């Protein structure tokens, strides 16, 4: 743990809030302190919140606006960049309640991203999304480094595996307008979640009930997946969680799935 007040504290579930700039910019003592706090969170709750990440608030907001413009496209323009292969994991997915658009790295042979035609206010969609993908990738690399530093192994231990950039950026939109059997653990190393003000995410407590992951402004939610638990011989938890309709208006979220 560190100086900040928990993001979630309920029913024995404690999800910490950590100032990530203290890992990136602090001296060796402060860096280690923050890294261990990050590891501690993944070892107990399997979830943490980060603040003061290098991804700036104004860029996040622009990216959310850009996502909104994409989803306002007519249906056929979105189907024209439709999802293809499971190995691809790229493109638009229509409902079948909610819709999504998935972007991967630009240089995977035989699996290019299906980019929409850019006219009017969609001009800059591609450059914006590739930017955000790269910044999410850098953040993924740094979070794995915090885990390594926290464990007391070499900071760069995970770099080779995350440097391939084998990640998916997923834009989600729930048009206006409770779920069960959406309960799951993620498959990959870590997942970054940028949630809008309305929330919807719930994480299981050690006792066994689902607590709301209350949205906090300019914060990113990070959780470990099964692959990280595996790498750690189950010292790090891949915690069960689910998304739920909150207690009416349209909802947006952005997630970055690392090594899915
Ligand atoms: Ca999940």
Residue numbers in the entry: -1 to 94, 117 to 197, 208 to 277, 283 to 295
Sentences from the paper on this structure:
Like the TET proteins, T7H is also a Fe2+ and α-KG dependent dioxygenase. Here we report the crystal structures of N. crassa T7H (NcT7H) in apo form, in α-KG-bound form and in complexes with α-KG and T, 5hmU or 5fU. Similar to other α-KG dependent dioxygenases, NcT7H adopts a variation of double-stranded β-helix (DSBH) fold as the core. The active site of NcT7H is located at the front end (opposite to the back end) of the DSBH core and partially covered by the α10 helix at the C-terminus.
Crystallization of a C-terminal truncated NcT7H (residues 1–299, NcT7HΔC) alone yielded the apo-form crystals. The Crystal structure of the apo NcT7HΔC was solved by the SAD method at 2.3 Å resolution. The asymmetric unit contains one NcT7HΔC molecule, which is well defined except four surface exposed regions (residues 95–116, residues 198–207, residues 278–282, and residues 296–299). There is a metal ion bound at the active site, which is provisionally interpreted as calcium as the ICP-AES (inductively coupled plasma atomic emission spectroscopy) analysis revealed that calcium is the most abundant metal in the protein solution and the structure refinement yielded a reasonable B-factor. Since no divalent metal ion was added in the purification and the crystallization solution, the bound Ca2+ is presumably co-purified with the enzyme. In the apo NcT7HΔC structure, the Ca2+ is coordinated by three strictly conserved residues His214, Asp216 and His271, which constitute the characteristic HXD/E…H motif of α-KG dependent dioxygenases, and three water molecules in an octahedral geometry. The binding and coordination geometry of the Ca2+ and Ni2+ may resemble these of the Fe2+ to some extent. Indeed, our crystallization experiments show that co-crystallization of NcT7HΔC with α-KG and the substrates yielded only the α-KG-bound form (data not shown). In addition, our biochemical data show that NcT7HΔC could not catalyse the oxidation reaction of T, 5hmU or 5fU. The structural and biochemical data together indicate that the C-terminal region of NcT7H is essential for the substrate binding and catalysis.
